[PDB]
Design a protein around this motif. Structure first.
Motif, PDB file in Angstrom:
ATOM      1  N   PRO A 196     -45.852 -39.821 -18.309  1.00 28.08           N
ATOM      2  CA  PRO A 196     -46.476 -40.901 -17.518  1.00 28.08           C
ATOM      3  C   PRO A 196     -47.957 -40.994 -17.639  1.00 28.08           C
ATOM      4  N   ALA A 197     -48.441 -42.256 -17.519  1.00 30.70           N
ATOM      5  CA  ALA A 197     -49.835 -42.498 -17.599  1.00 30.70           C
ATOM      6  C   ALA A 197     -50.626 -41.781 -16.546  1.00 30.70           C
ATOM      7  N   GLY A 198     -51.743 -41.263 -17.032  1.00 28.68           N
ATOM      8  CA  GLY A 198     -52.674 -40.517 -16.217  1.00 28.68           C
ATOM      9  C   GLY A 198     -52.441 -38.993 -16.148  1.00 28.68           C
ATOM     10  N   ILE A 219     -48.300 -29.889 -20.050  1.00 35.04           N
ATOM     11  CA  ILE A 219     -48.363 -31.115 -19.309  1.00 35.04           C
ATOM     12  C   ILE A 219     -48.659 -30.767 -17.844  1.00 35.04           C
ATOM     13  N   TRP A 220     -49.657 -31.463 -17.284  1.00 33.10           N
ATOM     14  CA  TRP A 220     -50.057 -31.257 -15.854  1.00 33.10           C
ATOM     15  C   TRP A 220     -49.683 -32.448 -14.970  1.00 33.10           C
ATOM     16  N   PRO A 221     -48.518 -32.382 -14.356  1.00 35.72           N
ATOM     17  CA  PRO A 221     -48.194 -33.552 -13.435  1.00 35.72           C
ATOM     18  C   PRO A 221     -49.050 -33.398 -12.198  1.00 35.72           C
TER      19      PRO A 221
END
Length: 260
Positions: A196-198, A219-221
């Protein structure tokens, strides 16, 4: 559900897909062929640069050392180093180019600075990796030749977790490495295409001469612990361009498994 979907994806792709992913919050994992060997291809640059960063602790001023090279050093894919043959580049600048642009001459220069391909191997051995091997330089490391220059999905994740999230490096070397990976320019159609974006992603791609396509990433949600993953692919069709969309499809499977 996720390992079934990965097996279905592999059937659609036509070849072999190796996946391992770890959610560092839950501790949960997803895997398919996670213990099988694959060529690392240019994903090994992650470790070459990490080995340079560790070496700086014993070689004061290493990152600022200016390396001179020649036209013979310049390879077909050398987007940065091809522009500075007359004037040289610093070791730091070679790490930047090697990771952000997958510069092959940059990689080779750094391997020479370390003392050859087995020095990166000694480095990963020091992290407790007894699986990975490094043998050749660019571009021959992309050509299957026995098990030279191979790792497994699960091992690549262990090492990336140790280097980007834990204490494989000192904190400034971890920041240097991690920023270069976050700033990669060659991964937009791979793991990043599915995220996802951002959300911030650190990644390093690799590819071979017969359609082999790899990506490893953190990946850092928002609001949760990061995910570390590897997707390695080998098409039966040696001219296939399906590797990158296959990586993105596998990533979507993984992210859904991890509730993201």
């Amino acid at each position: 559900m996720a390992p079934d979907e990965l097996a279905s994806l592999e059937k659609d792709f036509g070849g072999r897909i190796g996946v391992y992913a770890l959610d560092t919050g839950s501790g949960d994992t997803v895997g398919h062929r996670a213990d099988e060997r694959f060529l690392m291809c240019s994903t090994v640059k992650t470790f070459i640069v990490s080995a340079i960063l560790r070496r700086r602790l014993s070689e004061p001023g290493l990152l600022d050392q200016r390396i001179q090279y020649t036209q013979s050093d310049v390879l077909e894919w050398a987007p940065i180093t091809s522009q500075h043959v007359s004037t040289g580049m610093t070791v730091s600048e070679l790490c930047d180019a090697t990771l952000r642009y997958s510069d092959n001459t940059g990689a080779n220069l750094l391997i020479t600075q370390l003392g050859g391909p087995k020095e990166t191997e000694k480095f990963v051995r020091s992290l407790g990796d007894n699986v990975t091997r490094m043998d050749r330089t660019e571009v021959q490391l992309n050509i299957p030749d026995g098990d030279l220059d191979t790792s497994t999905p699960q091992q690549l994740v262990a090492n990336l977790r140790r280097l980007v999230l834990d204490e494989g490096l000192d904190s400034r070397g971890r920041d240097l490495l991690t920023d270069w990976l976050k700033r990669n320019t060659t991964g937009d159609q791979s793991i990043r295409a599915a995220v996802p974006a951002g959300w911030t992603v650190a990644d390093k791609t690799g590819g071979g001469f017969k359609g082999e396509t790899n990506d490893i990433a953190v990946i850092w949600p928002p609001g949760r612990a990061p995910i570390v993953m590897a997707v390695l692919t080998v098409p039966e069709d040696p001219t296939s361009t399906k590797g990158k969309p296959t990586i993105a499809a596998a990533t979507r499977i993984v992210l859904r498994a991890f509730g993201a």
